[model samples]
Target: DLHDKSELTDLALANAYGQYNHPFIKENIKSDEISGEKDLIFRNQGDSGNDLRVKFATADLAQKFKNKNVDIYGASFYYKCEKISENISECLYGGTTLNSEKLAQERVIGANVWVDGIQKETELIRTNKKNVTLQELDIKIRKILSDKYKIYYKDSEISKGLIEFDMKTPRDYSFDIYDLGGENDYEIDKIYEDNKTLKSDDISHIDVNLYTKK
Candidate 1:
C-alpha cells in the first residue's frame, strides 16, 4: 500500500497500472513531455470506455490529455494486490479526486483490479476450441481458487460441462462469481436444487456452494 501526495500525470497513472506503452498514450500524449522523459502508451474493451482521462500538472495542461475532462488531484496513490486481500496480487489504483462527483467514481475505479483478473480467468472458460478437457478446466479453476482469492474449496469436480465447487469468505467472505455475463451481472441464489447456469461456452456454468466448515 503506497500512498503518495506527489503530483500525478497521465504517464504516472498509466505506469502505475503497467500501461505506460499503451497506444492511446502514445497517440494522445505524443506532443507532451514529462520531467525529462517523453512519450507513453495506453484499453477499450467491455465496460472499459473509448478513452481514458488522467491527471496532469495544471488544468490548462490537463486539457492536453485525451479530453478536457482530465483529472487533476492534489495527490495520487496505489494499493498493491496483497494490500487489498490475501487472494489477489495485482496492484490497484486507489484513486483521488478534486470533488465529490469523482469521489463516487473512486469506489469503482479504485477496485477495477478486483474484477479484472476474474474476467481474465474466465476467458479460458469460453474456449474457441472444439474440445476442452475437464482436467484443463480444473487447472483453470485451480488458478482462480487460491489464498490470493480466498477460495478455500481445494477440490472442484467437472462433469458434463458443469463444475461444482465450494466457497467461503470472512464472516463468510464475499468472493465473487464470474461468467460470460461479465462482471457483477449475476446474482447468487440460495436454492440448492435450482442450480444456476453461468456462461454459454463449452462449459455451461459452475455449480457453486457456500461452504460452511463442518
Candidate 2:
C-alpha cells in the first residue's frame, strides 16, 4: 500500500510516470511556481521495478504533467491514465480531466439502466443510439445513480465491461453494458470495488442484454 500521507500530493503525475525528461514537466518540477522546487518529493517504489513517484505540492502542479510525455533511460512513455482513486479526489469527485476516448474501432451495445439495484430503467436509455461509447454510457449511468439516490455521483469503476458507480451512499450501483466485452451475468458480478470495499447486499446490478453488428 502507498503511504496514506502520500495521497495528499501524489497525483499519479510523477508516480506512475516520470516527469524529469519532458520539457514542460521538467520546467514545472524545477520552478518555484507552486512553491520552492525543493518542495517536490520523489520516492522510489523500492523493489517495484525501478518505479519512482513524485509528490507535487498541489493538484494543479501535478496536472502540468497531465498529457505530457517523458523519456526515461532512453524509453519514451506517456503518463499512466489516472484511475478512480480516493487519492485523486479530483477524479472521484470532480471527474477525470483526461480524455475518455472510444475503446477501439467501433463498439455497438445495448445499454440497460437499473435503479435501486432492482427496478429496471431501460426506457431511460432507450432513445440512445444503438452504438454507444464508454463516455456516453457513463453519462447515462451517472444520471441514473444520481437520480436514484438523489445524491451526487461520487466515483465510478469500469471492471471488465460492466460500469459501476458509487452513489455517494450505501450500496454498489450498476449499469451493465453489452457487447463491450464480457457476459452480462458475469459482468454484473465483477466487483469494481474489489480492493476497496464491498458489502454483501450493497451490489446494484444492471444488464446490457443485447448487441448488434454494425
Candidate 3:
C-alpha cells in the first residue's frame, strides 16, 4: 500500500514481516557502533505488539533498506548490519542487539528466486543445512480464488510460511506467507483492482500447503 505506482511494492511487502521499522537513528544512538548501534534494531511496533521486525522479500530489498532511508509510521529511517541474521531478534526496549552478534531476523542474503506454474525459471538453490521455512504468504487471487517455505543457508530465501492478500487483488498473482508467529489464513473482506474496482467483500480465507523440494 505504500506505493501504488511501483509494480514491486506489493511484491516487496508480501515478503516483508510486517515488523514495521527501526526507531533509533545515528543521532539517538547510545553505543559507539560497538555491539549494534551501527545496525538496524527492531523495536516494539503498533497494535500487533510486535517489534519493528520487517523482513525483505529479497536480500536486495534488505540491502535496499540498508542503502537508503525508508519511511515507516510516516517517518524516514535506515538500517544496516555486517551480516543479516537468521532468526527473530530480541525486542527488549534496551537489550543488546540480540541478533546483531552474528545475524537474526531472517534477513534475506541472496539469490531468492520464485517460479510460477510456468517454465524458464532458474534453478532453485539449497541450504547446506536444513534451515526450515519461516516466511508467510497472503494470497487473494479473486480471478480464480484461493491459495498459497524454508530456512535456507547461504543465498537464503524463504522456503514457505504465511501469506496475506490484504484482501486486495492485483494482476500479479492469486495471493500471498509462512509462520514466524502468524497464522496461514486471513479473512479479506474485499479485493481491489488497478481499474479502481472493488469485488465482493466476502473474500474467503483458506488454508495453504507448503512443500520443500527434495
lDDT of 2 by residue, 1-214 (tens): 1121122222322321221122111111121222223111222211222223333334654454343332111111223312122232111111111123213433223335433344355533321222222233344443443344321211222111235533226544444332211212112212221212222122233353211111
Top TM-score hit: 2
lDDT per residue as tens, model 3, 1-214? 1111122233233323222222221211221112233233344332233234333323333333352333222111122212224533322111111111222332222222232222222222121111211111121111111111222111223244222322324322233332221211111111111112112132223323223332
Error of 3 at 30 (Å): 16
Off by over 4 Å in 1: 1-124, 147-162, 165-202
TM-score of 2: 0.22
Of candidate 2, the 10-residue stretch with the lowest lDDT total is 89-98
lDDT at 148 for candidate 1? Answer: 32
Query: Candidates 1 and 2: which is better by TM-score?
Result: 2
Model 2 scores a C-alpha lDDT of 0.27
Residue 160 in candidate 1 has what lDDT?
A: 11
Of models 2 and 3, which has the larger TM-score?
2
TM-score of 3: 0.21
